[PDB]
Design a protein around this ligand. Structure first.
Ligand code: HEM
Length: 188
């Protein structure tokens, strides 16, 4: 990953799991517990992987479970660093815009590699959102969704539809139902 995102993860882990757990885990991979990560740095995905593995060991929580929790809380962290994205009224609009934001950053930020988050309405009160990535952060993705619902104070039901790997790409499709109708058939 790029530096920006790893910065948020470290912060979120600490908020979640305390300072000693994180300090220790970063040292285990040879990092400085209080490393200053710059946005445009490139960070070894395997190093991150080993960090989270250590957090798993120290806390006794399954790594997948940690990512789920990290995903939920990281929305709070990210909204504090980058408030403008969260400035809108609605959860649905937030979610529907995310794919565009991702495409744009791939273009703007050298080396940046965010997943596709393809969203499309499937009923008056529902969209499908498909995560597509070379990485595979199924639990993180799901966590982010819940965190978003939490931030926007809009209850949603999330049901997983498809999960699988093809051609080196991990995919996860969910159906997200909103409380009220948000879509309308309008003509082509
Ligand atoms: C709120 C504004 C957001 C911005 C500006 C943003 C942008 C980014 C960036 C820059 C990365 C890292 C790319 C890299 O380091 O190579 C990333 C990773 C990721 N983003 Fe977002 N994101 C946002 C919200 C979300 C939301 C709401 C979701 C899910 C609904 C999401 C899904 C993911 C996932 C799952 C990753 C991990 C990388 C992977 O799985 O391949 N992001 N995002």
């Amino acid at each position: 990953m790029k530096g920006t995102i790893v910065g948020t993860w470290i912060k979120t882990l600490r908020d979640l799991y305390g300072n000693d757990v994180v300090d220790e885990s970063l040292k285990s991979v040879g990092w400085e517990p209080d490393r200053v990560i710059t946005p445009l740095e490139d960070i070894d995905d395997d190093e991150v992987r080993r960090i989270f593995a250590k957090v798993s060991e120290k806390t006794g929580k399954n790594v997948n479970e940690i990512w789920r929790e990290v995903g939920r809380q990281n929305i709070k962290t990210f909204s504090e660093w980058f408030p403008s994205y969260f400035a809108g009224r609605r959860l649905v609009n937030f979610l529907m815009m995310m794919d565009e934001v991702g495409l744009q950053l791939t273009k703007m930020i050298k080396g940046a590699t965010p997943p596709r988050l393809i969203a499309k309405p499937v009923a008056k009160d529902a969209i499908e959102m498909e995560y597509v990535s070379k990485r595979k952060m199924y639990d993180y993705f799901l966590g982010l969704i819940e965190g978003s619902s939490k931030f926007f104070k809009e209850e949603i039901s999330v049901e997983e539809v498809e999960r699988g790997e093809k051609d080196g790409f991990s995919r996860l499709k969910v159906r997200i139902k909103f409380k009220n109708p948000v879509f309308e058939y309008k003509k082509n």
